[PDB]
Amino acid sequence: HHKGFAMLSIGKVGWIEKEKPAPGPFDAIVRPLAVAPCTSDITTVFEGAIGERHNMILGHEAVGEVVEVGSEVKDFKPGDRVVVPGATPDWRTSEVQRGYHQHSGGMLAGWKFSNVKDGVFGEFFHVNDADMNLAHLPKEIPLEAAVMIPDMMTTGFHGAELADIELGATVAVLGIGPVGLMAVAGAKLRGAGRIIAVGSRPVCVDAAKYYGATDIVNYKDGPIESQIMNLTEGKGVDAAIIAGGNADIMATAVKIVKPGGTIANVNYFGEGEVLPVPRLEWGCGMAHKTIKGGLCPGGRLRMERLIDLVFYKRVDPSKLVTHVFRGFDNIEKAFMLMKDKPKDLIKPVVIL
Template sequence: MKGFAMMCIGKTAWINKERPIIGPFDALVEPLALAPCTSDIHTVYSGAIGERTNMILGHEAVGRVVEVGSEVRDFKKGDRVVVPAITPEWRTTAIQEGVPAQHSEGMLTGWKFSNIKDGVFGEFFHVNDADMNLAILPESISLEQGLMMCDMMTTGFHGVEMANVQFGSTVAVIGIGPVGLMAVAGAALRGAGRIFAVGSRPTCVKIAKEYGATDIVNYKQGSIVTQILEATKNHGVDHVIIAGGDNSVLGDAVTMLKPGGVIGNINYFGEGDSLPIPRLAWGCGMAHKYIHSGLCPGGRVRMERMIALVKYGRVDPAKMVTHRLSGLEGVEKGLEMMHSKDADVIKPITII
């Protein structure tokens, strides 16, 4: 089968591989629609998770089931499914011990596609533990909507969950690419009062406002910390969701946060050995400013809950789709669009 792969750090190419072999609990899926992610850019061009050789890229897909293992009970050939970016192994004692499923076999091991195994940018791809990781995509939900659930929606909403956003609270979302936009939408759904969205691209700003942002902070117009502190009369914000930025952004988040506030980090820091925290802004370590970070939840139930939010009109993640490409070959162009970050790009997708 054909797939678009990372050959080594800094190099991609089309390759041919054997069709994946499934186990008794697994499924083989063919893609119906695919999307590239900034994480793929970090993996390929920054070498953020180390060297990978001849590994098919991609972790955002909706597809059609081609084959299921002998022990799969809830899915069959022909089912249209949402495939979460994170597909944990659910049959582990670590989960019984309280370890988040995303790390059930070790840190970040729920992130299998284009990390531990081949990703979804191929003619077929393998899904482990199908009954626990796939979700039926209703006919009433579009491929575009389903595709945005796999990673962008669940990740953005996880930032809101980790930041513990409350009714009427003040929130800053740093970075309004697709994940940050979903964090804005999630904060609004959670009942936030004032929502600062940090970004500069007009296309993203427009969608941020549609999703509920009340204030736009343009980092090109000065320090985002200064702008937010001035806007809040030096009170700061109750919650910060980090969805973009370089290694200095954690320090910015700590500085703009009130004592007692919570940071939810969903940013993929792709370079460097450490993330600095400003000592005084963190109250010499005693400010009661809490930092939570995590890999987005995956699995069937999570996807079914994302589906319910879309099905019943709470949010439309398809607003983020700015470019539609055709055919499997479109993933190469889509990935380059995410790499170049042109002003009019939020999320390109490929319809197979």
């Protein structure tokens, strides 16, 4: 028996008592040391983004301590401090041999926590294939910084990776929530010169400057496109990373990218039948404006590499954490903080 903060049904959350998970021969049981709520947890409960769920523990961002391992786990022992990726895919599928573990076994099936499997907002959680989906966490990295790696860092950096940024290129980041702020840092880690951040909330404008943004575009001062087309003197941006906004942010991205550039989306679109690609500004189909959109990489290797970027001081994700709470109870308060969305909020963390 263990307790966990779960989604009871649509529009309903509460604490439930559940059977403590048991590990298979290749699995591990981890208890959380620090968790953070996601905008997907809000979208899952109150908007049915993944369908109906009943008594499903929420959360997919956790650093924890290994409690038990299966008989065939060889690299992780009880007591180990580990960083747990948000996506813990099955590594023995055809999609992995194609190079897309994010979709191992189905579209976005690499993401299991709080989807097809109880999330991390519990006293314990299950990790499948520990040797492939766990990374050792150095003590030198504080917990609140490390818990930004499972999703926030790997998603934002993936946007910069998908953008195929060349050295000195001009990159626009549309949306500067916690994911967008990691896209700014990621663009700087891909050699971007000028980085134009698009957002309004002062807490995020300040963090965007910290992570490398050279320009701030407020949608209040006029259309994003015009602002960006003037900042670049009609040349456009080499790449645009979509990290937030409505479906029509796709149209904005296509309009600001020069012919031959890339639109890299890592934002979750939860409404509309269509994401609009403007026919004229996409060259009527022929502008060579590549559109990409991908779930964040997970697994052990991805986490180890992002841990090294924190360890060797190439990025400090702790500026994303605006709220830290203590105690298991405060998972509810941090979750509700993600629904209610103050103005000073980037990301909350609950330390256990």
